[PDB]
Write a protein that binds this ligand. Structure first.
Ligand code: BR
Length: 131
């Protein structure tokens, strides 16, 4: 396959969303460390419900309990493109994302990119425990 990708500029954030009945956790990571973490009271969700939370939508709640599940949301941007991609479980190169979106916008500074990334879940950030 291709020997590599060489984007002239690349900003990336990996958002790990952990679903449990008691808490849902949002971990924004760069270079393997959280740069922002927040948590909301958990609720039951269907698989489509979890994807909608990953998209930043408000899904219907379910009364049913479930076991812990990890979703991996990847934001990347060049100066002229922005990608939004959602995996059930962790990213793998062989794994098909459950949602993949490409925006013809890009970002020239990381601060603007990070602000744009946060906006996807801003309504959940309003619901955070430590407020
Ligand atoms: Br919090």
């Amino acid at each position: 396959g291709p020997l590599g990708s060489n984007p002239a500029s690349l900003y990336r954030i990996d958002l790990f969303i952990t679903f449990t009945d008691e808490l849902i956790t949002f971990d924004y990571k760069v270079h393997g460390r959280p740069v922002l973490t927040f948590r909301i009271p958990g609720f039951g969700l269907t698989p489509a419900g979890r994807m909608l939370v990953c998209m930043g939508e408000k899904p219907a709640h379910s009364p049913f309990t479930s076991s812990k599940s990890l979703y991996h949301v990847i934001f990347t941007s060049t100066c002229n493109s922005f990608s939004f991609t959602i995996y059930k479980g962790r990213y793998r190169s062989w794994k098909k994302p459950i949602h993949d979106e490409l925006v013809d916008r890009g970002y020239t500074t990381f601060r603007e990119f990070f602000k744009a990334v946060r906006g996807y879940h801003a309504d959940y950030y309003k619901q955070r425990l430590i407020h």
